[model samples]
Target chain A: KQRVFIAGHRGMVGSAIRRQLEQRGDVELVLRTRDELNLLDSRAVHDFFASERIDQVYLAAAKVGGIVANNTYPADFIYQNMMIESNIIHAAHQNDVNKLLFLGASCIYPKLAKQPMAESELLQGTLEPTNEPYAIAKIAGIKLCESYNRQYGRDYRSVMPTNLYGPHDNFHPSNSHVIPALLRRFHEATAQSAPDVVVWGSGTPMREFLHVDDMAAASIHVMELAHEVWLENTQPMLSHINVGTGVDCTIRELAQTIAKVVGYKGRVVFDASKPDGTPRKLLDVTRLHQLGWYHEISLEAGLASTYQWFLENQ
Target chain B: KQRVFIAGHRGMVGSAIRRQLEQRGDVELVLRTRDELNLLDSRAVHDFFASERIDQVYLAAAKVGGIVANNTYPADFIYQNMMIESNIIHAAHQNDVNKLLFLGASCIYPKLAKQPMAESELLQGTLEPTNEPYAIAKIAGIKLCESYNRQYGRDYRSVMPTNLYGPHDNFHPSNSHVIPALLRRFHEATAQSAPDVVVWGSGTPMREFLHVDDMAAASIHVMELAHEVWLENTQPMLSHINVGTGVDCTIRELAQTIAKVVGYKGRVVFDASKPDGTPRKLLDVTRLHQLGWYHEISLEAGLASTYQWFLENQ
Candidate 1:
């Protein structure tokens, strides 16, 4: 059995990867909490890699937050995330762990990237100011992994996932993402017998969402790809693969879909005064598709399963 | 007297900045050797910041190199540089050090940047692949300072210097920059009575060179700017000032000038097969001029003086 270390095994996608790996009888997983191991400490992380006889790593750990928090304390995000990536990637290379997967976000693309943004959109233009710091960190992480691969011939890959939602996602009212915020607000609205639920913006903004389980499977597919196959799809400098369904829906459609999934009997309202984010944000998953891994989970089906997880987990 | 710390004080720009600061009676400078203070050690750097009581900082330290070493060991360039920036900047903020200046390079601009590349040219296009890893690290450093300033109102600033040459520049046969390499090669070629000296490229590529002293001067000038004036000249999101002479010359002119300066009576030949890095690389110093600083040293004069230093130091 291969020994695998998941850097962040508690977050939504990390936990899903953990669940999928647990069912595989051919893997032994290593996990750590922030208290047990501090990733920010370079030496500590080096020693962890030195001591652990691990075979592979899932680099899903990150310093994440909402837009407000990201904009408010960007230093906290950039500094911590840069350190985490540098320390872990350098340590992994130092200790001879040949395989690792770095998890990045779709925000790594430019703010005004073309619709169905391809992998080449990175660093083409200015980033969205709201999360530029976070995006900068993820860009560095991707560079770090690719650098290691080039310098040391290590199989360090990166996957930039689109909006991820599933169990263990931040469902708290404050500091939550769009899907969870919607899931909780609509569920609570129905529970409280409210006549109407208010959603932010004009409901015209388009986005792509990926179920956490699908993200997990994609991560594994990327991590375990044949060396020649991986190299065929990625360049040395631009190696990050975009993970999404290659499809998008307007916010109105997503909200309506959630309402149907939740069986909400109320009106879905869009406040025009609220901020509508970007007009469209989706990933071109041509590289991943070419690598022979189509996302098995459909949007409506993924939303229904995610809603089920939210009900049970909440 | 204000206590100031100059990281990488022994390097070319840092030592020049050190010489400039030594003439100031109102400042006390703190210097550390690699053995005395390990910059990659996050805890050690933080503790040093906490204990040093530094009122200001000059972050000039970096893992820098030419194309071969950078391309060969891409990980080293990106990781160490990223660590140095994060460890220092984050620690400075945590310890309440108000004023800091980050030193960056021209490579932060895109490879095909427009002639006289403006500050807005950053992240607008792809970088020179030979040094993309290092370039990415410097870009991150710029953004890191901007983020800290935006989030905490810290007075951290960054200055991106064009190709610098002066006293204490790397004059070794290997890893030397264009100016020093030419300076050394012509000096030695003159000494050996060589018939002809072969220069790299077609000697048609144009480049801008700045003396390290002027770079140091610009560093202190930017660091000591009036807060109001600095704010007026720079935006929060885009704050890095580009330092250069705003002039460029063809490599053929530089080679001919060096031959004349070194009194080498040999023919200057260009080897076209050697890779010509870029057709033209120069910075738009309009931002620096608006901030009231301009290059005072001329290239020939600077090269002559630098040759004198090489005579004694070597």
Candidate 2:
């Protein structure tokens, strides 16, 4: 049995990973709350690692927020995320935990990257300025894992997930992501029997979405893959695998899907004056497909389940 | 008088910056040895900044090394450098220390960046893999400074210097940089009356060099510029200025000059079989020049003074 430490066991992605690991009998899970151990405190992190006897790590913790929050508190986004990744990755190495899985966001790709963003698109151009600080921190996380594996012969790996939505996602009106925010708005509109629902932007930006459960599944699959198979599929430097469905739908399509999931029949109004970010953003999951893994959750089913969770949890 | 904290006051670049700052009577220089203040300790750093009552910071600290050292100890290079930057910059902000200068290296530019790489070349392409970890850390440092400035309206700035050489450089044969390594080799060859001194590669690749003193002078100049003037020349997002002589010389020319400076009366041989790295690497100094600071040290004179320092110190 392997002793697996899920660093961010409370967040949406980390909670899904924990649930998945909990169902398995061969794995013993270790977790610590923010109060139990501050990941930003390097000394405490190192000390905890020295004592925990962890055999593998899933570095899923991060200071996440929407665009407004990112722009409002860029320093917090970069500094906290950098510290969390550095502290955990470094401590894991110091304590001889040779296996790790670092989670990264697709925002690590260039702002003007090709529509189907591949792993190779990283560091190819400038990042989207709204979340550049957060993106830089995530990019450094990937590099940290690669560097450790190259230098110490460690089995540290990284996975970059596309936009994720599921249970435990932030549903606050001012700072939630597209899916959750829309899901909540539609839910409320249906509750209030509103005449129409106003959606921002032209509803034309094509984007990809992955269920957090799929992300967790992919993370575990990558972690448990044979080392030889992994090495054959990835270069030491360009090693991070992209986790996504490799398919995308426009915002209008997403809004319609969420409306169907939430049982909203009101007319959907699009505010064209609002900014329509990049025209398209999706991950090229070729590497993942070649490595014997593909996402299982369909968008409709994922959204329906997420809406169910929001109803129960919120 | 302003209180200036030179973070890595004992290193080669940091010492030069310290000397330059010390010569100015208007600033009270603050320095702490690694034992006195562990930069990697977030709590210690935060406490020190809260209590130091400092007004300015020279973030010249980094975990620097040659290719072999970086490749061998990649974890150390990335982790220590990231922590040092994150701890100091965030602490400086927490304490409301407004004026700060972050020093970065030219390696932040892409490996295949355009000849005479401009400030815009950052994150534009792939990095040289040998020291990618160190480079990534340095890039994060720059972004951290920029993010703070954008979000907090702090006068935090970053300067990227070209290859630097001068007093206090590592002259160790196996793990030092090009200039010191070459200087030591040429000096020993001359002392032993060797017939020929063999150099690596074809000696045709063009490279740029900046004396550490020049780098120090430019850093101070940038830090001391009027706020209006600094804003006029830099963008909030793309604000890092490149510091260099805007000049370059072939390896053969540099070797000849080093030989002359060292009084080596031996022929210099170029071993073509040794890999020639990038064909040319120079920084576009247009931004620095527009800001009214030009490098003052000529290569020949800088080499002479460096050789003298080596003679007296070594």
Candidate 3:
């Protein structure tokens, strides 16, 4: 059985991978809490890798937040995430744990990236100022993987997912992503029988979303890709793959769907005066498509299940 | 008197700063060899910071190399540099060290960045394939400084110097930068009374060089600048200053000058078959100039002194 270390097994993406992996008998999952094995501690990470003999690693553990949180805790977001990536990736290589899947966010693209941002769009321009620190760390992580692969013949891989939303995602009202924020807002609106619910931003902007399950699937699919296929698809220095559904919906459509998923009949309103961060943010997932992985969950279906989880937890 | 800790005090830039700082009566400098303080060990670095009570730091420590070495040892270049930066920087912040200057390289810019690249050109395009790992690590270091400055109001600064050449630089015959490589070759050719000295590339590409001592002076000047002056010139997220002589010269001019400085009364030939890399790579140092600092070492004088040191060391 292969020993797999899910570095942030308690987080959404990591937990999703853990769910699928725990059901399989071929893997002996190695999970660690922050207290048990501080990923920020290089020595602890290296010692664990030395003792665990991990055959693979899922670097899903990272400090993540929305724009407000990113702005409020810039140092924390950058320092903690950078440390986590450097510690785990370096340790995995030193211990000869060749297989790794470093999960990154789609935000590694420029602020003004072209519609359907491609894998090549990375570093083509400036990043969104609000989260530049987080973006740089992710970019560094991808380069770190490529560096190891080029220098030591390691099979480390990186995947930058579109905005992710799922059961285990942060549902914090003030500091969560659009999907979870909307889901919680609509659910509460329905419960309180409010007159209507208000959503920020003009309804014109389009964005992409992926369920964590699908992201986990893609991570596994890419990690298991044949070496020949991977080499043919990815260059050694520019090796991070984009993981997304290659589909998008406007903010209005997203709000309506979330409200429908929450069974809220109240009218939905969009504040046009509020900032619409970017007009369109999508990923060119042709690489993932050609690599033989696709998202199974539709936005409507994904939102319905996420709303269910919110209700159950509440 | 102020206590200053200069990391990487054995390296070229660090030692240059040490040379200047040792002359100052108001500063007590702390220098460490790699064995005395393994920067990669987070605990060791943290312990040093906890005990040093340092008021300031010069973070010149980095795993540097030429193109061949960068390609062959990409992981070492990236991992070691990233660790050295993260360990020292995070510890410095935790131990309440307010003033720190991070020394980076011009390679942090894009490979095809516009000639006379400005401070705003960072992350504008992809990096040179040969040294992307090093570039990413340095870029990450700059972002880390900005993150801390934004969040914690730390007076952390970053300086990206153009290609540096001086007495203490690595002058390996094959594994060195152009200045040292050419200086040594020209010296050897003069000594042997060879028919000619052959230089790589078409002798058309232009480059900017800085003496390590000038780099030290600029580092000190930037560090000692008033916070109001710094804030006026730099944005919170875009705070890194370029340290360089804005002037550049073609490879032919450079080779001829080096030959003259070395007193090599021999012909010089350019090998057209060899790779010429980029045509022009220079830093825009207008910001530093506005901050009231400029290079005091002329190219010829710096080369002459560097050649003298080479002869003495040989």
State which candidate has the highest DockQ: 3
Once model 2 is optimally superposed onto the true structure by TM-score, how far is the C-alpha of residue A66 displaced, in angstroms?
Answer: 0.3
**Candidate 3, pairs of clashing residues:** none
Interface RMSD of each: 0.9, 1.0, 0.8
TM-score of each: 0.97, 0.96, 0.98
Runs of candidate 2 with Cα error greater than 4 angstroms are A273-275, B173-176
lDDT of 1 by residue, B195-224 (tens): 999987899888998999999999999999
lDDT of 3 by residue, A221-297 (tens): 89889888988888887788999999989989999988888889989998888897777899999999988888899
| lDDT of candidate 2 over A194-223, digit per residue (tens) | 988988899998999999999999999999
Summed over model 1, clashes come to 0
DockQ of candidate 2 compared with the true complex: 0.79
TM-score pick, better of 1 and 2: 1
Provide the lowest-lDDT 10-residue window in model 3 chain A.
Answer: A167-176
Q: How far off is residue A227 in model 3, in Å? A: 2.1
Give the TM-score (0 to 1) of chain B in model 3: 0.98
Q: Is candidate 2 or candidate 3 better by TM-score?
A: 3
What lDDT does candidate 1 reach at residue A112?
Answer: 87
Mark the 10 consecutive residues where model 2 chain A has the least summed lDDT: A170-179
